[PDB]
Amino acid sequence: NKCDVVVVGGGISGMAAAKLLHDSGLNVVVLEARDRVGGRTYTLRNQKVKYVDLGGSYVGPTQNRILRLAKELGLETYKVNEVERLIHHVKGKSYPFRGPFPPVWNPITYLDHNNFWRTMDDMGREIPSDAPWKAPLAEEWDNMTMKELLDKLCWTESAKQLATLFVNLCVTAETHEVSALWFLWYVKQCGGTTRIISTTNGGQERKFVGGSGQVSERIMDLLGDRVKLERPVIYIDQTRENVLVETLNHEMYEAKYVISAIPPTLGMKIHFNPPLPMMRNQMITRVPLGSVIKCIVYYKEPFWRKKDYCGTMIIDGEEAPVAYTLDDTKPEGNYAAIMGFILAHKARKLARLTKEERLKKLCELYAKVLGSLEALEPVHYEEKNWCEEQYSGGCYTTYFPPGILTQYGRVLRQPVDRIYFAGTETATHWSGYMEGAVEAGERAAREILHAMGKIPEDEIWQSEPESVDVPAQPITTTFLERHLPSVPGLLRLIGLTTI
Amino acid sequence: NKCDVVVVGGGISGMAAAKLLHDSGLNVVVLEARDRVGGRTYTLRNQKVKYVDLGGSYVGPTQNRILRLAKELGLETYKVNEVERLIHHVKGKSYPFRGPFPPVWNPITYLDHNNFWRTMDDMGREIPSDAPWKAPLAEEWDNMTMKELLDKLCWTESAKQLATLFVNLCVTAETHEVSALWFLWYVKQCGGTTRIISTTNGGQERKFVGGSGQVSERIMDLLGDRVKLERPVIYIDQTRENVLVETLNHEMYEAKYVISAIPPTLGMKIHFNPPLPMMRNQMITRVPLGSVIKCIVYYKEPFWRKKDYCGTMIIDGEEAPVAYTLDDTKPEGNYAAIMGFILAHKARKLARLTKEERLKKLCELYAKVLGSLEALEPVHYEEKNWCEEQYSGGCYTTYFPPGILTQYGRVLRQPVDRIYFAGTETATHWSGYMEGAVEAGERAAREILHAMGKIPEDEIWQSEPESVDVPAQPITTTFLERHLPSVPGLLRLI
Ligand SMILES: *Cc1cc2c(cc1C)nc1c(=O)[nH]c(=O)nc-1n2C[C@H](O)[C@H](O)[C@H](O)COP(=O)(O)OP(=O)(O)OC[C@H]1O[C@@H](n2cnc3c(N)ncnc32)[C@H](O)[C@@H]1O
Ligand SMILES: *Cc1cc2c(cc1C)nc1c(=O)[nH]c(=O)nc-1n2C[C@H](O)[C@H](O)[C@H](O)COP(=O)(O)OP(=O)(O)OC[C@H]1O[C@@H](n2cnc3c(N)ncnc32)[C@H](O)[C@@H]1O
Ligand SMILES: CN[C@@H]1CCc2ccccc21
Ligand SMILES: CN[C@@H]1CCc2ccccc21
Numbered sequence A: 001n002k003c004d005v006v007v008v009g010g011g012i013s014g015m016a017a018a019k020l021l022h023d024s025g026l027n028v029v030v031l032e033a034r035d036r037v038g039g040r041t042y043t044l045r046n047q048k049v050k051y052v053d054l055g056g057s058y059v060g061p062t063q064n065r066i067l068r069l070a071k072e073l074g075l076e077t078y079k080v081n082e083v084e085r086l087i088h089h090v091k092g093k094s095y096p097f098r099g100p101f102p103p104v105w106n107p108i109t110y111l112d113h114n115n116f117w118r119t120m121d122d123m124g125r126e127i128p129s130d131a132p133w134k135a136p137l138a139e140e141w142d143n144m145t146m147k148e149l150l151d152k153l154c155w156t157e158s159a160k161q162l163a164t165l166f167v168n169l170c171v172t173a174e175t176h177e178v179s180a181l182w183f184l185w186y187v188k189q190c191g192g193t194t195r196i197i198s199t200t201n202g203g204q205e206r207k208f209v210g211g212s213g214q215v216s217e218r219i220m221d222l223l224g225d226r227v228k229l230e231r232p233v234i235y236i237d238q239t240r241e242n243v244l245v246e247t248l249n250h251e252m253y254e255a256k257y258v259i260s261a262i263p264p265t266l267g268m269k270i271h272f273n274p275p276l277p278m279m280r281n282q283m284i285t286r287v288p289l290g291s292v293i294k295c296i297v298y299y300k301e302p303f304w305r306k307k308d309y310c311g312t313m314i315i316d317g318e319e320a321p322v323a324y325t326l327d328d329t330k331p332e333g334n335y336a337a338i339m340g341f342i343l344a345h346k347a348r349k350l351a352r353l354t355k356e357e358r359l360k361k362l363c364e365l366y367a368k369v370l371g372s373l374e375a376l377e378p379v380h381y382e383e384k385n386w387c388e389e390q391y392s393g394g395c396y397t398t399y400f401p402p403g404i405l406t407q408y409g410r411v412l413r414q415p416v417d418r419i420y421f422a423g424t425e426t427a428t429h430w431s432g433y434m435e436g437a438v439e440a441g442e443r444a445a446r447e448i449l450h451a452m453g454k455i456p457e458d459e460i461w462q463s464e465p466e467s468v469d470v471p472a473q474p475i476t477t478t479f480l481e482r483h484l485p486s487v488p489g490l491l492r493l494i495g496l497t498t499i
Numbered sequence B: 001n002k003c004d005v006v007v008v009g010g011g012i013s014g015m016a017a018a019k020l021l022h023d024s025g026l027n028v029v030v031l032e033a034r035d036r037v038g039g040r041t042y043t044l045r046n047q048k049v050k051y052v053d054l055g056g057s058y059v060g061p062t063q064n065r066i067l068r069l070a071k072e073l074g075l076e077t078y079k080v081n082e083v084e085r086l087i088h089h090v091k092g093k094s095y096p097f098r099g100p101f102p103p104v105w106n107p108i109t110y111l112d113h114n115n116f117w118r119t120m121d122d123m124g125r126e127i128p129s130d131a132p133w134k135a136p137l138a139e140e141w142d143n144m145t146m147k148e149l150l151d152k153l154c155w156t157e158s159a160k161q162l163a164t165l166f167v168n169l170c171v172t173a174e175t176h177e178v179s180a181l182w183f184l185w186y187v188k189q190c191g192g193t194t195r196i197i198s199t200t201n202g203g204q205e206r207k208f209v210g211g212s213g214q215v216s217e218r219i220m221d222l223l224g225d226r227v228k229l230e231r232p233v234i235y236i237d238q239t240r241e242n243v244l245v246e247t248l249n250h251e252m253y254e255a256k257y258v259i260s261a262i263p264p265t266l267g268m269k270i271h272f273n274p275p276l277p278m279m280r281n282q283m284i285t286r287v288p289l290g291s292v293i294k295c296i297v298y299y300k301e302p303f304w305r306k307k308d309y310c311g312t313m314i315i316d317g318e319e320a321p322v323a324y325t326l327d328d329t330k331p332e333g334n335y336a337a338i339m340g341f342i343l344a345h346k347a348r349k350l351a352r353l354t355k356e357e358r359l360k361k362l363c364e365l366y367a368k369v370l371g372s373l374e375a376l377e378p379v380h381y382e383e384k385n386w387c388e389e390q391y392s393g394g395c396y397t398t399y400f401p402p403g404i405l406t407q408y409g410r411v412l413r414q415p416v417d418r419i420y421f422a423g424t425e426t427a428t429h430w431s432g433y434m435e436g437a438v439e440a441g442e443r444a445a446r447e448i449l450h451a452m453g454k455i456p457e458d459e460i461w462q463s464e465p466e467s468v469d470v471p472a473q474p475i476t477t478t479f480l481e482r483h484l485p486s487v488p489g490l491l492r493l494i
Helices: A012-023 A064-072 A107-124 A138-142 A146-153 A157-171 A179-189 A194-199 A213-226 A263-270 A278-283 A305-307 A345-350 A355-372 A402-411 A434-451 A479-483 A487-498 B012-023 B062-072 B107-124 B137-143 B146-153 B156-169 B180-188 B193-197 B215-228 B264-271 B279-282 B303-308 B345-348 B357-368 B404-411 B434-451 B479-483 B487-493
Strands: A004-007 A029-033 A043-046 A050-053 A077-079 A087-088 A093-097 A206-208 A226-227 A233-237 A243-246 A251-254 A256-260 A271-273 A292-298 A309-315 A325-326 A337-343 A380-385 A419-421 B006-008 B026-029 B043-046 B050-053 B077-081 B084-091 B093-097 B206-208 B235-236 B243-247 B252-255 B257-260 B271-273 B292-298 B309-315 B324-326 B337-343 B378-385 B419-421
Touching: A004 A012, A004 A243, A004 A251, A004 B252, A012 A213, A012 A434, A029 A251, A043 A087, A064 A213, A064 A434, A087 A355, A107 A157, A107 A194, A107 A233, A107 A479, A107 A487, A138 A179, A138 A402, A146 A157, A146 A179, A157 A179, A157 A194, A179 A402, A179 B434, A206 B324, A213 A226, A233 A434, A233 B235, A251 B093, A256 A263, A256 A434, A256 B193, A278 A402, A292 A345, A292 A355, A309 A355, A337 A355, A337 B271, A355 A380, A419 A434, A487 B215, A487 B345, B006 B252, B012 B215, B012 B257, B012 B434, B026 B215, B026 B252, B084 B357, B093 B215, B093 B235, B093 B309, B093 B357, B107 B146, B107 B156, B107 B180, B107 B193, B107 B257, B107 B479, B107 B487, B137 B180, B137 B404, B146 B180, B146 B324, B156 B180, B156 B193, B156 B337, B180 B404, B206 B303, B243 B257, B257 B434, B292 B357, B303 B309, B309 B337, B309 B357, B337 B345, B337 B357, B357 B378, B419 B434
Parallel strands: A004 A029, A004 A256, A029 A226, A087 A309, A233 A271, A256 A419, B006 B026, B006 B257, B084 B309, B235 B271, B257 B419
Antiparallel strands: A043 A050, A077 A206, A087 A093, A233 A243, A243 A251, A292 A337, A292 A380, A309 A325, A325 A337, B043 B050, B077 B206, B084 B093, B235 B243, B243 B252, B292 B337, B292 B378, B309 B324, B324 B337
């Protein structure tokens, strides 16, 4: 019934918020809709897989908050396999390579690729992480889709195709679905193109031994009966001295403050008294989550390694159900597996099939890409279609269609009376990720601590010491990468020398 | 507690569905979230205005279902004043005109304008009303915004500006916010550019004497205590023999079937057991409603008529809070008023101001456009910002951002077990309008009648006889309008 703070949602963000408040001496309750904590993280355990992350999994350098929280909870990481060669599969053929980026040999195509990534980061530098709507060209950039921007920037089909895959992979949405401003913000707030796309020295460097679900689970262990499972929140009433929070199973909770730690649009599942202010009322109808099926195919051995392939495949083309894979073999070298994502429209297209039908399509694809008949002999399969989840709405995160971030963005984490807003979507660094979940949950918690007069204003936002275990190498560029002209840039130089 | 059909939502669509089912002999209950019926229609009554529609108001030729339903309920229409000249205000200057379209005098600009409207209708002819995702170029058109399409088609800034206003007015959203496929469908399913934009012989021809709210009110009168006000639905359970519907005020309703007659996205406010299928689960997060403040400024007399202006103003430019007005004077000639819409981003921008501040801005604008100091002397003001409504989400209707209609459109009115879907968004003719609300409510009702084996399949969708009171004149084009080249077309010939 009565407490200091009700946290709506027991994902990483809600759990991090609850833990901070609990550690500060406040009485907290976490109201979680599902029969489990973890939300967009979910670690399945069975005999065949031991454990497998079916939701959020990867962590890496510069994600210091999630690393610190997990370490405190007694968790360890291991490195995703990137020892052997990566594969870029394009136009039905595989091209092995090393480094974060597939090599480009054609001089013109090379200039185009180089310019595209450079320009993405150039534009990102103009976008404040904590206020993307303050970018000098915010309106101009927000009013076009990523598709339009790619059409403008990419003078080769090769660059456009790879850029498209990049967008699909980063935000589980189509290039025509998302605002260019929002996407450029999203990449910049993850530290840029190299950081977001890299395994070694990037977002995909590591996984947690035993699964990421342990973060939420171990916080639940700490909080005991303060976490209430199968309590979907239906109603929040702020008309009286204490906030009243009602659940679907007819329980009433009374609190001084509330943290909403659910995906922004899932705020729609709550009836508000008094009604939300106009901007938030409409905002929460304008912010969908992406579409993805995460699929893990198990094999007797990590046979790709014997062919000097690490298991990473970047697979272009409409026919391919999966556009991106990583080796998901255990650190011990057993439970050999390939993780792949079925992205955006393909998640919707292929959801119609049976589990067995999807497994067959994936194996046949992997056999082709890896040039290996062994890929046709899986020993086990697990998958999760996040599009079907009532209490997630999708994965990985919320995307902003054209025009929305500038018009409604400022309200995303603006308190509504005594309701404060956590959730990865409200983070300013690695929003969309487990890292962003921690940042947002702890920030929301400290907003309440400040409201209670327990901490000064300048302690609401808190820096994080760099992990000693996962140090971050800086992102570097070469002289040629910095100064080589774009395709139209080269054409100008040809135009002027001819004149 | 127990009934045949629970209808969620007591707007026109829910009420029309409930009435049909009731008239067929079924026991119906309407669960309405608000303390009133009508939803996106709302007629305010007070001494100063007598009555005023603050939500949906206009009806016109080809909207035969709403006209028939209203007539049966004892309502009458009157004609919106369009006797005198319309005004197009552009680059700070007023240009009076007659007919539905503001004239263009520059020859190149004429070709560009002519081509734009023609092309909109040309494209629409390839879009099936009942299945826009089956258009031959559905994906190509769905993957671009209306902004991109206008940028492609309009060789003049004049055409682009007017086209932008047209989009803003029709769907209370920015050109860059909406799918081209969806917008082209929207116009086509209202009978095309001329029909949707016209007062005389179009969607804005008429209003209901006494207000459109009377439609929902009078059906509530018929249904008696079957309508439950302040019963927001929170939970629908289909795991057992009978469907269980729970409200926020802790009441339980048991039914054989349910009609969801709420805006698609407002389905999010209901927790479902079992969960919705994947496609609907995501669809209802991808379909926002537009943004609008409807504002009515009252005056001692309809003074604009004395200057041979009817009260219609089409006002271009960022500075103008209101881009479109109509005379809102009563048929009797009293309660003189100008109705104006604050559209899309301007609704969001100007919501910050006070009611009095908005009144001042509107009066000063109207004084400029009408060239009359009398506009500065209002006697009364009413307004409604639909963006603030928890149980509407916006107005007039739901828009589809790029990529959504093709990927999710087919699921909009697909039944989910024993839940059938009404609401204007699911109509195939005048979706977005009161007309569409009636079409969808009655169709959803008849889907259930068919499910019960009471009517054959071919009776689910039913034609509507043309109103004798509001006959439709056909939409015509001239030889030159049909065959004059576009700007690039002329450049080819050169
Ligand atoms: C789905 C997914 C996510 C993901 C990814 C791959 C997939 C398939 N890969 C990631 C990765 O490799 N590395 C990474 O850092 N992130 C990755 N992501 C995203 C990541 O999982 C999320 O960013 C993160 O988990 C989000 O955490 P957050 O706490 O902000 O949000 P949540 O997990 O969705 O938690 C919300 C909880 O609230 C409950 N809920 C929802 N509605 C209610 C109501 N009405 N009442 C009470 N509780 C509610 C949900 O059940 C959930 O537990
Ligand atoms: C807002 C608006 C609309 C409008 C317009 C101008 C404005 C400012 N001008 C119009 C016009 O001139 N001519 C015309 O034909 N239409 C015009 N529109 C649109 C028109 O008002 C709508 O198309 C029509 O009213 C829609 O009717 P429909 O029945 O489909 O939808 P609704 O009115 O929104 O009714 C829904 C009801 O459901 C209730 N609700 C919502 N959630 C719940 C829950 N969870 N439980 C129970 N009830 C719920 C709403 O309260 C509402 O009453
Ligand atoms: C949340 N991060 C997603 C999850 C996997 C991945 C891979 C490359 C870039 C981004 C991502
Ligand atoms: C719902 N119809 C809207 C409401 C008023 C109007 C005017 C022109 C075109 C469309 C519209």
